[PDB]
Amino acid sequence: STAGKVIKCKAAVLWEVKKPFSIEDVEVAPPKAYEVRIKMVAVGICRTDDHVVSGNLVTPLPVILGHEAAGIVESVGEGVTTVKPGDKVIPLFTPQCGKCRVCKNPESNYCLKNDLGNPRGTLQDGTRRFTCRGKPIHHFLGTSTFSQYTVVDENAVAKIDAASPLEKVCLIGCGFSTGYGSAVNVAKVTPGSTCAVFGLGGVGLSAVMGCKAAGAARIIAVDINKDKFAKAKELGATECINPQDYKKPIQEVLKEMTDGGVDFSFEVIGRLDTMMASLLCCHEACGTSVIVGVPPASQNLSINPMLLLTGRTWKGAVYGGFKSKEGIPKLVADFMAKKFSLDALITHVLPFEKINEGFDLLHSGKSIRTVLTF
Amino acid sequence: STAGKVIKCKAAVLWEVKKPFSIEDVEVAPPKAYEVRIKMVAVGICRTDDHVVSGNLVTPLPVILGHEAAGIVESVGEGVTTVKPGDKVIPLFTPQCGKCRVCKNPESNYCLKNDLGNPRGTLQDGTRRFTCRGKPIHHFLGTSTFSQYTVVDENAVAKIDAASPLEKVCLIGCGFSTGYGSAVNVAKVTPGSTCAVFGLGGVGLSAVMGCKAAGAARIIAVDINKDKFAKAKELGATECINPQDYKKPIQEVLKEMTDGGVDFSFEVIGRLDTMMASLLCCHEACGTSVIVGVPPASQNLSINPMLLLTGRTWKGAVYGGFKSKEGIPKLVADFMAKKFSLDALITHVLPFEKINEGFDLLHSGKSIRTVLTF
Numbered sequence: 001s002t003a004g005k006v007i008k009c010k011a012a013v014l015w016e017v018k019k020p021f022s023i024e025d026v027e028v029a030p031p032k033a034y035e036v037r038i039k040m041v042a043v044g045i046c047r048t049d050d051h052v053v054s055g056n057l058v059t060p061l062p063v064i065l066g067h068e069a070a071g072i073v074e075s076v077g078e079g080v081t082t083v084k085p086g087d088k089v090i091p092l093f094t095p096q097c098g099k100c101r102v103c104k105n106p107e108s109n110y111c112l113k114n115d116l117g118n119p120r121g122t123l124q125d126g127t128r129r130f131t132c133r134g135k136p137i138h139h140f141l142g143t144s145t146f147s148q149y150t151v152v153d154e155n156a157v158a159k160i161d162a163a164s165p166l167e168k169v170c171l172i173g174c175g176f177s178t179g180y181g182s183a184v185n186v187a188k189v190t191p192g193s194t195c196a197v198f199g200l201g202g203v204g205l206s207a208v209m210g211c212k213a214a215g216a217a218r219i220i221a222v223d224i225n226k227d228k229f230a231k232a233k234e235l236g237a238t239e240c241i242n243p244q245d246y247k248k249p250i251q252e253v254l255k256e257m258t259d260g261g262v263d264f265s266f267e268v269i270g271r272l273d274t275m276m277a278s279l280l281c282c283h284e285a286c287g288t289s290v291i292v293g294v295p296p297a298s299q300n301l302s303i304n305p306m307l308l309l310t311g312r313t314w315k316g317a318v319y320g321g322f323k324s325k326e327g328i329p330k331l332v333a334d335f336m337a338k339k340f341s342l343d344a345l346i347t348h349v350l351p352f353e354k355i356n357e358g359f360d361l362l363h364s365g366k367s368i369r370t371v372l373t374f
Numbered sequence: 375s376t377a378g379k380v381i382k383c384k385a386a387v388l389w390e391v392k393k394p395f396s397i398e399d400v401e402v403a404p405p406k407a408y409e410v411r412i413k414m415v416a417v418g419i420c421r422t423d424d425h426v427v428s429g430n431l432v433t434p435l436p437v438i439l440g441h442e443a444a445g446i447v448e449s450v451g452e453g454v455t456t457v458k459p460g461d462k463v464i465p466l467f468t469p470q471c472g473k474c475r476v477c478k479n480p481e482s483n484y485c486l487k488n489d490l491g492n493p494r495g496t497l498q499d500g501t502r503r504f505t506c507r508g509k510p511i512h513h514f515l516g517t518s519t520f521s522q523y524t525v526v527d528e529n530a531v532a533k534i535d536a537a538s539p540l541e542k543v544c545l546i547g548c549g550f551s552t553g554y555g556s557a558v559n560v561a562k563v564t565p566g567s568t569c570a571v572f573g574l575g576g577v578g579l580s581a582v583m584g585c586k587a588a589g590a591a592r593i594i595a596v597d598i599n600k601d602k603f604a605k606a607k608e609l610g611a612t613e614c615i616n617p618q619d620y621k622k623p624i625q626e627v628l629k630e631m632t633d634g635g636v637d638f639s640f641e642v643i644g645r646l647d648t649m650m651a652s653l654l655c656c657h658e659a660c661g662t663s664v665i666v667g668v669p670p671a672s673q674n675l676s677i678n679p680m681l682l683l684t685g686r687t688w689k690g691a692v693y694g695g696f697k698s699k700e701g702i703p704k705l706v707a708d709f710m711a712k713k714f715s716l717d718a719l720i721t722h723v724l725p726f727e728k729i730n731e732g733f734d735l736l737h738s739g740k741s742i743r744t745v746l747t748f
């Protein structure tokens with residue numbers, strides 16, 4: 001019925017920054033060659049989506065955000081070999097074209113086909129598939145999952161287990177993968193090591209889970225919102241610190257707690273002051289600091305190079321180091337194999353139409369993750 | 375015989391910053407427990423020594439500098455078990471106490487008994503062994519080799535091959551180990567990779583050799599002194615470029631020549647602008663920039679954290695990641711086995727008394743490594 005036909009549906013369109021989303025009628029064009037048109041089922045709210053709402057992450061507007069989600073293949077374009085209609089899928093905010101220098105490198109995952117470096121708000125072919133009131137609307141990270149239907153490039157979609165509960169598994173689309181992989185793939189936490197995690201939201205907590213799985217002996221959870229400590233400990237944090245209870249700077253408080261500093265620290269928030277704190281609290285001779293939080297546009301850090309000369313390793317990564325099209329699937333399988341659980345991360349489930357309410361909860365600090373359902 | 379007695383000898387004293395070295399008679403107190411008094415045979419002139427003179431590295435004056443050396447054990451204090459009088463040895467600017475958190479950690483080498491963090495200008499017990507006209511003289515990195523005799527802690531001296539040519543293996547005491555290990559140990563250069571080395575002094579040329587040993591496919595040597603190019607080439611560089619020949623920033627050139635950037639970048643000069651260019655020239659998603667150059671005191675770098683989120687790795691190291699006491703002897707054995715040659719690095723040989731002429735050669739850019747004989 002719908003195949004090859006333009007689908008009219010509802011989607012949350014952002015026309016301006018610091019404005020609410022508009023649940024409007026938009027026309028979703030049919031998938032071109034090597035493209036897949038997905039029917040969304042569950043979409044989780046990531047702070048990155050909010051970054052555009054706040055102006056911290058610039059991207060052409062009007063836009064349809066969303067990138068953390070799960071859905072079903074409504075139809076595919078010509079040349080599509082990986083997914084067929086009906087297949088359960090997870091759109092990847094970072095592609096794996098498999099042909100660029102990066103994709104060919106065994107330890108890189110930031111494919112050259114991404115729309116993060118220099119945002120165009122289009123699909124890999126430079127064009128858009130969304131329209132609304134005679135106006136073309138921009139995509140976001142080539143996923144735009146805040147819509148009942150969306151078109152994505154084949155190399156940016158991954159087929160998952162047919163029995164996968166799309167309402168939970170949508171987190172593996174971003175939050176869980178990013179945090180967990182940051183600990184296991186990027187930092188490469190060693191068994192018996194000491195770790196520190198700044199920020200305890202959806203991504204932060206999965207970093208706790210990742211350090212735990214890696215065998216970290218001590219995991220120090222850091223957050224100004226005390227309410228997150230309950231979950232942090234439950235997921236594996238050995239202790240919880242709130243920077244506000246101290247008269248002393250956090251990195252100092254941390255170094256005196258761990259005999260000179262932690263082995264691995266992760267900044268999962270997105271502030272310069274906290275990224276400075278994470279670099280400073282990891283032992284000057286053998287510590288590794290992993291930046292996970294997305295920094296506000298055009299801001300810099302002033303660092304003394306002596307901080308690295310002694311032996312510190314400072315790195316960062318997108319998507320927790322997982323090569324998208326391969327990693328996400330295998331992750332779902334592990335979830336199926338009951339290797340881990342995403343239940344503690346989902347605190348609120350709202351109907352798509354109340355997306356604006358979902359962003360409110362994120363700003364009030366009442367929710368870890370909120371899953372908008374279709 | 376001089377054991378147990380105060381030795382009187384010549385040493386090069388720096389009384390004030392930015393002033394020539396003054397060759398004076400000093401008294402060298404005999405060694406205490408776990409200390410070794412050494413008779414110097416050959417010393418190399420490293421830019422770090424010059425960093426104190428110029429004022430870029432702060433350390434208490436007046437002082438006896440020098441740290442890349444080779445000599446013979448004159449006598450040992452009570453408790454010493456790792457060396458005996460007559461042994462050929464290399465003092466280590468960074469000790470390997472073997473009992474601290476860092477020494478236990480198999481991946482870090484920056485021992486806690488170092489005098490680089492906050493220089494006391496003493497031995498490990500907190501005292502000095504040099505006197506000059508009543509005035510006690512400060513030590514440097516616990517080694518102070520610009521003297522005919524010096525005393526070092528036992529954990530800062532490595533016993534080497536009895537047949538080692540001391541006028542050659544002194545480079546292994548610092549310059550070579552640092553350069554070669556930065557590539558092989560710290561960056562862990564992968565075979566078939568592309569490398570950029572900024573700075574072609576004795577340390578930077580050892581970084582080049584190390585990249586070649588690692589099997590890099592390309593090694594681009596950068597330096598504003600074209601007279602260094604002939605040696606870089608001979609040592610492994612596939613190409614050499616002079617930033618002054620270009621219209622655009624060196625980082626943009628390097629990225630254009632290597633399909634987006636190198637895989638491994640090395641800053642071996644000690645300047646802020648080059649450490650930045652060095653980070654910027656390694657591929658945003660898979661590059662590793664390694665800081666080897668000692669930056670001028672209290673100077674800060676201003677960086678956009680986004681530069682790291684894409685996948686870049688930024689780190690630094692001392693002594694090229696080698697655990698001093700263990701690594702030096704092994705490296706001397708490799709030298710003995712012809713595994714590598716030091717001849718190209720050693721461009722000048724002058725008697726100790728001509729030390730000022732040696733620093734002048736460095737300043738003019740006419741030398742790579744100048745060795746001083748006693």
Ligand SMILES: [N]C(=O)C1=[C][N+]([C]2O[C]([C]OP(=O)([O-])OP([O])(=O)O[C][C]3O[C](N4[C]=NC5=C4N=[C]N=C5[N])[C]([O])[C]3[O])[C]([O])[C]2[O])=[C][C]=C1N1=[C]C(I)=[C][N]1
Binds near residue numbers: 467573648692
């Ligand atoms: N880390 C460690 O361990 C170390 C370090 N360090 C450092 O390094 C550097 C360098 O050294 P050297 O090699 O000796 O020096 P020289 O000879 O002077 O060389 C330099 C080079 O560079 C070049 N440049 C300049 N500028 C520039 C350039 N290029 C380009 N661009 C620019 N701008 C010149 O020409 C020459 O050639 C320094 O910094 C030092 O410091 C060393 C060693 C080691 N250590 C540490 C220690 I406490 C002691 N030692």
Ligand SMILES: NC(=O)c1ccc[n+]([C@@H]2O[C@H](COP(=O)([O-])OP(=O)(O)OC[C@H]3O[C@@H](n4cnc5c(N)ncnc54)[C@H](O)[C@@H]3O)[C@@H](O)[C@H]2O)c1
Binds near residue numbers: 048175204269294
């Ligand atoms: N690299 C990536 O792949 C990637 C992926 C997804 C998200 N992110 C980024 O990760 C970061 C967090 O994502 P999330 O969705 O889990 O966010 P979130 O907003 O729900 O959680 C941020 C947490 O940090 C805490 N916090 C805020 N200011 C703090 C401070 N100054 N000190 C200590 N804690 C503070 C908040 O209480 C909250 O618990 C954001 O920057 C997001 O853009 C990065």
Ligand SMILES: [Cl-]
Binds near residue numbers: 127128136
């Ligand atoms: Cl268009």
Ligand SMILES: [Zn+2]
Binds near residue numbers: 097103113
């Ligand atoms: Zn790719």
Ligand SMILES: [Zn+2]
Binds near residue numbers: 046047067068174175
């Ligand atoms: Zn996300």
Ligand SMILES: [Zn+2]
Binds near residue numbers: 548
């Ligand atoms: Zn040196």
Ligand SMILES: [Zn+2]
Binds near residue numbers: 472477
């Ligand atoms: Zn030690």
